[model samples]
Target: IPKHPDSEAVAPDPFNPAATQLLDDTSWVLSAWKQADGTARAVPSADQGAPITLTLSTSTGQRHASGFSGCNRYMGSYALKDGKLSFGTLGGTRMACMTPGGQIEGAYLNALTHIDRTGVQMRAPQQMQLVLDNGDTLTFDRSTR
Candidate 1:
């Protein structure tokens, strides 16, 4: 995959309202993660274990969010207001994790809470990138069931 520069410097935020509609009944698997310093972070592949994932559901009237966060599966509520995305308190199973998976899991969950901007691309090879409050970028590809 090609490298992605900081979006703030490259272009205006991509908070596309059109893509927000695609969130419901959709899922994404973590494909890449970049730190605020532009360094690539370790993201596990399916071969390692469970692929880090995120799922958005329109269950009932609320937007429910759940996924496997490297080591554990988490569930929470999500809101898309004015093209921005945010999550409520996310709780998950308390199973013991081995190594880097634990670290990545912690970071991914924390990133959800501090999303500064949300970029969604709904075309072929769709993706959603979450830019966190501290400039970290988490990218996910639309998962095929």
Candidate 2:
């Protein structure tokens, strides 16, 4: 698990929508960006160097998750309890992103690993927020895909 940054940033704000109302065992789009730095743009795909839209699947005990990283599809395990979420070690196919998107993908992965302190808040069934201790926030929109 990543440790929180030295700076005290924004905590997880109450989710605007709420996740309990959303149906389970579904795929939703996810968007995220790092906050420890300045205002960084959220990429659209996981491998595009932007905040990728990941499909959070929680149908079984494995509750496996997967999504397009703008290059390769990645999958991993996850769990949420008491408003906290943990993404188990994630691994993506070795396919390389040759375009500019690939470059961003590399940086994005580096940035995420450095993020330590984090909190997850869900509002809508598919919408949630990953709040970093450094005031950086990743706002995610989820829906049946």
Candidate 3:
């Protein structure tokens, strides 16, 4: 597992409409981060040379999670039952990114390894809020494809 970042950044004053759209059963892009108290945090951006994304699907009614870690692509299995969520072993490619992007990728992968339960909710159409077991929230915008 990778280490989580220690730095903190403030989220936008008000939620961005595009960031809070309703999400469906498909791919999504990472847009923002938040603490348990709903304090928004900073997320890597294309401007920073890192564009992290995720794709979620089901197999035989079982949920599977996979995506790019801003560096390497990763695949993993997840379970969400009765409001509790847990992830199985996650495997990923060894490819790497440069600079802060790689660092951000490490942190992102680390976060996935530690999730206990997810607070999944759709705040807007085509958008979803995935609250990790550790109180860190990952906001995702449904994929256009």
Estimate TM-scores for all models.
Answer: 0.82, 0.59, 0.63
Q: Which ranges of candidate 3 are over 4 A from the true structure?
A: 1-25, 35-42, 47-50, 58-63
Report the C-alpha lDDT of model 2 over 83-132, residue by residue, as the tens digit.
44555776776677676554455654444443343333343454555555
- For model 2, the stretches where C-alpha displacement exceeds 4 angstroms are 1-13, 16-26, 31-34, 45-51, 58-61, 107-126
RMSD to native for every prediction?
5.1, 8.8, 10.0
Better of 1 and 2 by lDDT: 1
TM-score, model 3 to reference: 0.63
Which has the higher lDDT value, candidate number 2 or candidate number 3? Answer: 3
1-145 in candidate 1: lDDT tens per residue?
8887655665665546677755778888888899988998988877886689888876545778988897888888887765567778887876777868655667777777887767888876688887777788888898868
**lDDT of model 3 at position 133:** 63
Ranking by TM-score: 1, 3, 2
Better of 1 and 3 by lDDT: 1
